[PDB]
From a paper:
The Omicron sub-lineages harbor multiple mutations in the S protein compared to the original strain (referred to as the WT strain), which mediates receptor recognition and facilitates membrane fusion with the host cells. Despite the extensive mutations, all these Omicron subvariants still utilize ACE2 as the host receptor. Binding of the receptor-binding domain (RBD) to the peptidase domain (PD) of ACE2 triggers conformational changes in the trimeric S protein, leading to exposure of the fusion peptide and facilitating membrane fusion with host cells. Hence, we characterized the ACE2-bound S protein structures derived from BF.7, BA.2.75, and XBB.1 subvariants.
To further analyze the RBD-PD interface in detail, we also determined the structures of monomeric RBDs (BA.2.75, BF.7, and XBB.1) bound to the ACE2-SIT1 complex. These structures provided improved resolution of the RBD-PD interface, avoiding the flexibility of RBD, and were resolved at local resolutions of 2.9, 3.2, and 3.6 Å, respectively. Similarly, BF.7 carries mutations F371L, S408R, L452R, F486V, and R493Q compared to BA. Despite the presence of these numerous mutations in the subvariants, our structural analysis reveals a strikingly convergent binding pattern between the RBDs and ACE2. Of particular note is the single difference among BA.2.75, BF.7, and XBB.1: the substitution of Phe486 in BA.2.75 with Val in BF.7 and Ser in XBB. Additionally, the salt bridge formed by Arg493 of BA.2 with Glu35 of ACE2 is replaced by Gln493 in BA.2.75, BF.7, and XBB.1, reminiscent of the wild-type configuration. Overall, these mutations remodel the interaction network into a highly convergent mode, despite the presence of diverse mutations within the different subvariants. The monomeric human ACE2-PD exhibited binding to the RBDs of BA.2, BA.5, BA.2.75, BF.7, and XBB.1 with binding affinity (KD) of 4.80 ± 0.01, 3.2 ± 0.03, 1.2 ± 0.01, 4.1 ± 0.02, and 16.2 ± 0.03 nM, respectively. These values displayed heterogeneity compared to the WT RBD (12.5 ± 0.04 nM). However, despite these mutations, we have identified a convergent binding pattern between RBD and ACE2 in the BA.2.75, BF.7, and XBB.1 subvariants, suggesting ACE2 mimic monoclonal antibodies might have the most broad-spectrum neutralizing potency.
Author numbering:
A (entry chain D): 19 to 615
B (entry chain A): 336 to 359, 364 to 517, 523 to 525
Write the structure that this text describes.
């Protein structure tokens, strides 16, 4: 009759009804995503609204049990995940205003239009054309026009909305005892009451700042190399001791440097390994790819596919008229129903995306025995790390030469090694400073340390000091440059893309030692080893039942995220870069600007 | 013995109220079908033709796939404590098979109604069909739903696009007592 025993009684009924309603909602959403019609939209909206209403009613019902008298840890976790008010703690007018400005920001970002100065009836949206000009063009003036106009004709509409969204979200977050909206975001990595694995919401800042303090020696050399290579495609525009103009980086924002590969390739006469001709040579189809992926997965000690995965999944694009949004994803409809939705062609990118998606499917199959509220990764940075280590270890030459896609001998040299390592560095290391800087800016904005008359100044000061890029045109306090990013205007967190990159290589080095690898880390293959599978399964099957600082120790041996595995992975490229910059100047000065002349 | 009825009825009962038919040629059941599970406990499965008893009973129901392992002497769970409890001195022999193609309709089959709340654990070979409201807290609810008072039936949501372990599995539990031979 105590206050603890009634919690379990409530949780049982909640679990059952929630499983049922969630399955109905997910089935409706899938039937819409694979077959676009008009009545499917309403048939999906009905189930979605029913599920949301049930969730809201159970949430407002669960407030009767005080989280202080609970003794079990699983019950306490489930209650605390259910008791959270979230939004709707505000008034009604404020909630309507918040939803309106959120939808307005999303719409402004989605359908923003810019057009030419000399032919004003030639307007281009963002996705079909702006991030294509910024991706393939090699003209300085055209890239500058695109980068300036996107921020001058769309970013200027998002500032008076962001200035209100900040205050509204800060109020909503202070209504739940969080001191700001940034602490509400960092509250995901919190762990309390375990006696040995505690983790405050304020230690994430220090951990991030201490793990970024050791990537600077490598990012500096990569920056110097990319600068010395860019001083040849746009002569007399880059200075040998200055930063890089922000429009010569590869895309609209500079998040990924991966489009600079055609300019900064180390050895341009050795083609990187790309087995696409052999697949069409042996006539591989959309099903042999997934058979090979499943074979690789079962090789390490993980179960087969559930046999309900083959008939219900959509592995090929439906032909006649079945307009379908096929963005490769893995579904978890529940009750033992797993499906995959993707438009597979016969290439190598699909051959790796199959492994990436089946990684998510295996993770979902792992923890399917936990209660309903505990079916997720340990935190927001485990799912993608697990899904990425598979595609990391499945694209090696040693693995490709055993399936049959490569010639039997195929001696490997060090030039292609450096080519591959550098192509990997432009995507892995080229985004960590950007992510860290953006999330630091957002934390300082929400916390209240950057008054609303010093937003752009501080943004560009930090972009000059941390990332190492400079703007080509002065931006006063009417612009809002971060708001022109998808994750900033659509209200998504951004610290997961930083911790995922560390967890990925931590897991890879932890598994390389159970498989007893010998050479460098970027030649690892975990296949044909039942120790790596066992170590990984000791963590996959936990879900959110345990604190993440314990699920991490059960694999790597430490509690906090580390940065040594990443440097151990990039060691050879590091030495080569350190010997290619004997004459250049490693570093930058924050005074040179492309307009100060 | 008319085994053609207890194995082939067009509609099987539910777990909380299982149909018990008494009997006043086992080579027809042993040699017939896939039979996903077939375990005989007191008597060896092969010599079922030389030892006979006073009467046999054939209970039946429809439970979920991953709960078949609970129909056994000395088990615990939402099925073996509240709906159907087999004594530790069992002598009969359990059988169960998959029936996904018959007892599952697209859109949900809400006629199978396992019970999940009860004041005490069931005794061996008892049946409880009462439908009173379970009182969780300390304040009586006088037979109405609300807070800390729930409806003790939680009908299965059967569908064809489920996974093995969530599909319907018919069950028959022959139990002997010592005639028919
Ligand atoms: C895609 O959805 C449309 C409509 O939502 C389906 O079109 C009809 O659906 C009804 C539903 O019972 C069927 O009776 C009709 O036969 C369907 N028309 C045709 C021309 O097939 C359509 O079948 C769906 N596609 C798939 C592959 O399920
Ligand atoms: C309350 O806590 C106990 C132990 O602190 C949990 O007992 C576990 O229960 C699961 C399944 O019910 C078993 O697999 C474990 O072996 C049990 N552990 C121990 C140490 O006995 C119990 O599950 C908790 N309550 C709930 C609702 O989860
Ligand atoms: C969640 O929101 C409710 C309001 O909707 C907060 O207020 C408490 O609600 C309970 C439930 O009826 C009342 O019994 C209390 O008197 C309310 N005031 C309190 C507790 O000061 C509730 O505090 C919120 N809880 C959380 C964890 O956000
Ligand atoms: C790849 O390896 C070869 C040898 O295995 C390297 O060639 C030697 O490089 C050193 C260092 O510059 C020279 O002192 C030797 O004279 C070279 N030997 C020959 C036969 O050329 C080559 O430099 C390596 N390439 C990279 C990119 O590391
Ligand atoms: C995993 O191990 C198996 C067996 O040890 C390998 O399968 C054999 O590989 C050799 C190497 O060419 C072939 O000659 C045999 O014909 C293979 N046997 C079978 C039954 O296929 C497999 O290649 C290994 N996989 C990896 C990635 O190392
Ligand atoms: C269960 O009943 C069905 C139908 O009553 C039986 O199906 C019959 O199968 C025989 C062949 O063995 C056919 O000649 C009949 O036409 C079928 N009847 C119908 C209506 O389908 C089935 O044999 C029975 N199974 C058992 C185990 O007795
Ligand atoms: C997986 O399925 C294949 C058949 O395609 C079978 O040969 C193999 O034994 C199965 N492995 C496991 C672990 O179930």
């Amino acid at each position: 009759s105590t206050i603890e025993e009634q919690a379990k009684t409530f949780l049982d009924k909640f679990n059952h009804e929630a499983e049922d309603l969630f399955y109905q909602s997910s089935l409706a959403s899938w039937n819409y995503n694979t077959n676009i019609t008009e009545e499917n939209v309403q048939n999906m909206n009905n189930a979605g609204d029913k599920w949301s209403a049930f969730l809201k009613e159970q949430s407002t019902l669960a407030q009767m049990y005080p989280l202080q008298e609970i003794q079990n840890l699983t019950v306490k976790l489930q209650l605390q995940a259910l008791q959270q008010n979230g939004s709707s703690v505000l008034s009604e007018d404020k909630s309507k205003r918040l939803n309106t400005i959120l939808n307005t920001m999303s719409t402004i970002y989605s359908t923003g239009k810019v057009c030419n100065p000399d032919n004003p009836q030639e307007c281009l949206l963002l996705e079909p054309g702006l991030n294509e000009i910024m991706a393939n063009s090699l003209d300085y003036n055209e890239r500058l026009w695109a980068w300036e106009s996107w921020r001058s004709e769309v970013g200027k509409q998002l500032r008076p909305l962001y200035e209100e969204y900040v205050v509204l979200k800060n109020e909503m977050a202070r209504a739940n005892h969080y001191e700001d909206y940034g602490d509400y975001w960092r509250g995901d990595y919190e762990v309390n009451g375990v006696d040995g694995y505690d983790y405050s919401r304020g230690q994430l800042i220090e951990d991030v700042e201490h793990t970024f303090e050791e990537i600077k020696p490598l990012y500096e050399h990569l920056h110097a190399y990319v600068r010395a290579k860019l001083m040849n495609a746009y002569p007399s525009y880059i200075s040998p001791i200055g930063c890089l103009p922000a429009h010569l980086l590869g895309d609209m924002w500079g998040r990924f440097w991966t489009n600079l590969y055609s300019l900064t390739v180390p050895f341009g006469q050795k083609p990187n390994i790309d087995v696409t001709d052999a697949m069409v040579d042996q006539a591989w189809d959309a099903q042999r790819i997934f058979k090979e992926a499943e074979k690789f997965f079962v090789s390490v000690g993980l179960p087969n596919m559930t046999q309900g995965f083959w008939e219900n999944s959509m592995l090929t694009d439906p032909g006649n008229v079945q307009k379908a949004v096929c963005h490769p994803t893995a579904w978890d409809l529940g009750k033992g129903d797993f499906r995959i939705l993707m438009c597979t062609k016969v290439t190598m990118d699909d051959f790796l995306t199959a492994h990436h998606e089946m990684g998510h499917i295996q993770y979902d199959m792992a923890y399917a025995a936990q209660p309903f509220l505990l079916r997720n990764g340990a935190n927001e940075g485990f799912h993608e790390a697990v899904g990425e280590i598979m595609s990391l270890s499945a694209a090696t030459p040693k693995h490709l030469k055993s399936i049959g896609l490569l010639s039997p001998d195929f001696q490997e040299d060090n030039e292609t090694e450096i080519n591959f390592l550098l192509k990997q560095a432009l995507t892995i290391v080229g985004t960590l400073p950007f992510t860290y800087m953006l999330e630091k800016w957002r934390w300082m904005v929400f916390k209240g340390e950057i008054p609303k008359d010093q937003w752009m100044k501080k943004w560009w000061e930090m972009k000059r000091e941390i990332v190492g890029v400079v703007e080509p045109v002065p931006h006063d306090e009417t612009y809002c440059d971060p708001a022109s990013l998808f994750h900033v205007s659509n209200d998504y967190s951004f610290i997961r893309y930083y911790t995922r990159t560390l967890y990925q290589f931590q897991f890879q080095e932890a598994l390389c030692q159970a498989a007893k690898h010998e050479g460098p880390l970027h030649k690892c293959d975990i296949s044909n080893s039942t120790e790596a599978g066992q170590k990984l399964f000791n963590m996959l099957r936990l879900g959110k039942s345990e604190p993440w600082t314990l699920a991490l120790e059960n694999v790597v041996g430490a509690k906090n995220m580390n940065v040594r595995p990443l440097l151990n992975y990039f060691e050879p490229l590091f030495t080569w870069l350190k010997d290619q910059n004997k004459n250049s100047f490693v570093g930058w000065s924050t005074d040179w600007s492309p307009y100060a002349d | 013995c008319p085994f053609d009825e207890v194995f082939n009825a067009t509609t099987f009962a539910s777990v909380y109220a299982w149909n018990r038919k008494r009997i006043s040629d086992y080579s027809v059941l042993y040699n017939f079908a896939p039979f996903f599970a077939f375990k005989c406990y007191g008597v060896s499965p092969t010599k079922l033709n030389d030892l006979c008893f006073t009467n046999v009973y054939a209970d039946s129901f429809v439970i979920r796939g991953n709960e078949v392992s609970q129909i056994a002497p000395g088990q615990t769970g939402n099925i073996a404590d509240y709906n159907y409890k087999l004594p530790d001195d069992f002598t009969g022999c359990v059988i169960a098979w998959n029936s996904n193609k018959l007892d599952s309709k697209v859109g949900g089959n809400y006629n199978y109604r396992y019970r999940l709340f009860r004041k005490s654990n069931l005794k061996p070979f008892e049946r409880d069909i009462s439908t009173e409201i379970y009182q969780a807290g300390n304040k009586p609810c006088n037979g109405v739903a609300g807070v800390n008072c729930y409806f003790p039936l939680q009908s299965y949501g059967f569908r064809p696009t489920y996974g093995v372990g969530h599909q319907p599995y018919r069950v028959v539990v022959l139990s002997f007592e010592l005639t028919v031979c």
